[PDB]
């Protein structure tokens, strides 16, 4: 029966790459060529937020594009009022061993996990005057990598144990779990309308899931190495997702198949973040060698480098106005690019 | 606008007294060493942590040593597969490594020194340094002593090497299980000597899982590490 | 999609010699060190030898050494272990494994659960 399962599930694959080969009609590039190039733009930093102890791994944007959120591991998760630089909130984590942050899109909770498998919900605006754990969500078996918010009472939590799950705040219980990953789960992307996202599993592929209906769609393997950060495309009909192997790539959702890939041969390090703009025309991706690229969405050109850091990139983030855009590092600040 | 200069009054205010709690924060977590204890499950680990310490995915241990706070921290409750976890510890002072000695037969010491090299050569954890306990002592004398299980037949080359002339064995052990743990450790050894760089060393130590300084032996370490990377920036070593 | 893929294996008697080949495919070959590794019934996953990316550093483990080989053909994207002087013992079955990252010479590629770059295996039986 394996073998012959093993041979039916091949012939399948072989079937789906046959069916996405008859759709490659023609390559993005081909038809993105006459465009004109966005050229160079130079980005320069206009702010500087310090007072983390160590450094620094993650950070999210607010709704309104003031306030943002920012975890380190000394223990401290603490939100910045970027246009002044005045510190809000430091809030201390009971963990010091914590790997991401949420900022919620009604401003009133705040989210963050990591080795202690454990996912906490702290408020923001208890009429004490004081951050107190709200909600505890203990379900895991492996490391929290990324958790993002649907709603007030909804919260949807990636882990390091090869599922991901939708939670019920309020009740604190598992509404749904989402399997069929083979290694760790590490990023995730809400979509615009959220009824749909998207996860990189460590095993070179990232699967599109449904929200409601709680069970896998469509699955893209392009990549060769584990995947560290993925992004949802603005318009909500592709997605760019990052990799070990030095190498970006665009997938679409309806024609089922990779569109284009930015890579370079003189660049051998992994990326640790991507995110797009506000228009969708320009990706950026921070990197391990201490600066940040921006790439052209369509030409496939490096256009610019942001090069104020001196240790690892580990998160970046445009704000939903596109007004700035934010990247912290292994060296305990965080930078505002516009 | 006198709202929003009370307003940014009263931000100000908020940030001072932020910055006070973060300086004094700063102040506690500098004066703080966190070790990583890191060894196969089969292994005294378990043992050795009881001994210190007289569903959650990480075990903290605070103790002190002559008025010195070291916090242990040891992962459990976690997959298999370490090459994406490990990377949190790449700031702490120490890796206390624990390894049995008395394990080659599956071949448990070749997976210990895979493992071992692994966490050697990786990227991000070339500036930590490996306190290594070769645990279990007894057993391997035991075993040794009068048996049939030959080093020789896992490790062949056990059977050209010879005791080192600087060796301090305990008084009382036959010849053979000095033989027998040198060749260990120097197995555990040609490893570490082989990177060149100099950033970290390694510290062997012949242990066992009831022995009582094991604790003073860490605080030890800890001090020659200190000290070593003090003497490499002033060009003194 | 990493596709590896093993070939060779079978029924040897005692004393004989066997070829085991793997095939790679979906990724740059000459960018990862590769390596064999084995199970044998009741037993968990051993390593058995490795490979670098050029084949200036070949690693065998203790029991093995002497008596295998290892070699890797980057124009075609193949690998090869030479095994003879087979004995009971080594009666398993064999992957051809890969490191996860490529430019590194760090490895974590025995795990026993799932290891999403390892092939399906090839069954090797030495005995009367």
């Known amino acids: 029966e394996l073998d012959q399962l093993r041979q039916e599930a091949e012939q399948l694959k072989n079937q789906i790459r046959d069916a996405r080969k008859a759709c490659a009609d023609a390559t993005l590039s081909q038809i993105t060529n006459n465009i004109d190039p966005v050229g160079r733009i130079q980005m320069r930093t206009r702010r500087t937020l310090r007072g983390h102890l160590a450094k620094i791994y993650a950070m999210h944007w607010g709704t309104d594009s003031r306030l943002l959120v920012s975890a380190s591991q000394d223990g401290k998760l603490i939100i910045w009022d970027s246009y002044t630089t005045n510190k809000v909130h430091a809030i201390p984590l009971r963990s010091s061993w914590v790997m991401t942050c949420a900022y919620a899109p009604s401003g009133n909770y705040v989210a963050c996990g990591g080795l202690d498998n454990i996912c906490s919900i702290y408020n923001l605006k208890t009429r004490e005057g004081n951050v107190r754990v709200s909600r505890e969500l203990a379900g895991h078996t492996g490391y929290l990598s990324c958790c993002r918010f649907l709603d007030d009472n909804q919260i949807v939590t990636s882990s390091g144990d090869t599922t991901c799950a939708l939670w019920d705040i309020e009740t604190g219980q598992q509404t749904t779990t989402f399997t069929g990953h083979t290694g760790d789960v590490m990023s995730l992307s809400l979509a615009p309308d959220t009824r749909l996202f998207v996860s990189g599993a460590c095993d070179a592929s990232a699967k599109l899931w449904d929200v409601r209906e709680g069970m896998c769609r469509q699955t893209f393997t392009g990549h060769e190495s584990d995947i560290n950060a993925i992004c949802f495309f603005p318009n909500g009909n592709a997605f760019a997702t990052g990799s070990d192997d030095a190498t970006c790539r665009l997938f679409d959702l309806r024609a089922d198949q990779e569109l284009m890939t930015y890579s370079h041969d003189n660049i051998i390090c992994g990326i640790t973040s991507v995110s797009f703009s506000k228009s969708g025309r320009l990706l950026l991706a921070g990197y391990d060698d201490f600066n940040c690229n921006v790439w052209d969405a369509l030409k496939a050109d490096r256009a610019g480098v942001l090069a104020g850091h001196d240790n690892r990139v580990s998160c970046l983030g445009v704000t939903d106005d596109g007004m700035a855009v934010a990247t912290g590092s292994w060296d305990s600040f965080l930078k505002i690019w516009n | 606008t006198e709202d929003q200069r009370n307003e940014e009054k009263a931000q100000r205010e908020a940030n001072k007294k932020i910055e006070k709690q973060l300086q004094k924060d700063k102040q506690v977590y500098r004066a703080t060493h966190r070790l990583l204890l890191l060894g196969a499950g089969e292994s005294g680990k378990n043992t050795i942590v009881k001994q210190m310490r007289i569903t959650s995915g990480i075990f903290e241990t605070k103790f002190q040593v002559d008025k010195v706070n070291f916090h242990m921290f040891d992962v459990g409750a976690q997959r298999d597969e370490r090459r994406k976890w490990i990377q949190c510890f790449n700031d702490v002072t120490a890796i206390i490594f624990v390894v049995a000695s008395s394990s080659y037969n599956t071949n448990r010491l070749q997976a210990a020194l895979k493992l071992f090299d692994s966490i050697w050569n990786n990227k991000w954890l070339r500036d930590t340094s490996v306190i290594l306990f070769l645990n279990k002592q007894d057993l391997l004398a035991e075993k040794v002593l009068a048996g049939k299980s030959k080093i020789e037949d896992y490790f062949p080359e056990f059977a050209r090497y010879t005791t080192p002339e600087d060796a301090t064995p305990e008084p009382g052990e036959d010849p053979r299980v000095t033989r027998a743990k040198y060749f260990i450790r120097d197995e555990f050894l040609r490893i570490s000597t082989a990177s060149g760089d100099g950033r970290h060393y390694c510290y062997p130590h012949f242990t066992c899982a009831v022995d009582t300084e094991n604790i003073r032996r860490v605080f030890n370490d800890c001090r020659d590490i200190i000290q070593r990377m003090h003497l490499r920036q002033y060009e003194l070593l | 999609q990493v596709q590896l893929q093993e070939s060779g294996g079978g029924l040897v008697q005692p004393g004989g010699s066997l070829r085991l080949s793997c095939a790679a495919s979906?990724?740059?070959?000459?960018?990862?060190?590769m390596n064999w590794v084995r199970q044998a019934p009741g037993k968990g996953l051993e390593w058995v030898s490795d490979?670098?990316?050029?084949?200036?550093?070949?690693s065998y483990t203790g029991s093995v050494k002497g008596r295998f080989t290892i070699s890797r053909d980057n124009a075609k994207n193949t690998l090869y272990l030479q095994m003879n002087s087979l004995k009971p013992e080594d009666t398993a079955v064999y992957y051809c494994?890969?490191?996860?990252?490529?430019?590194?010479?760090?490895?974590?590629?025995?795990?026993?659960?799932?290891?999403?770059?390892r092939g399906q295996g090839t069954q090797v039986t030495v005995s009367s």
């Open positions: 494994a890969r490191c996860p990252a490529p430019f590194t010479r760090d490895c974590f590629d025995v795990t026993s659960t799932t290891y999403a770059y």
């Open positions: 979906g990724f740059t070959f000459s960018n990862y060190k």
């Open positions: 490979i670098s990316q050029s084949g200036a550093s070949i």
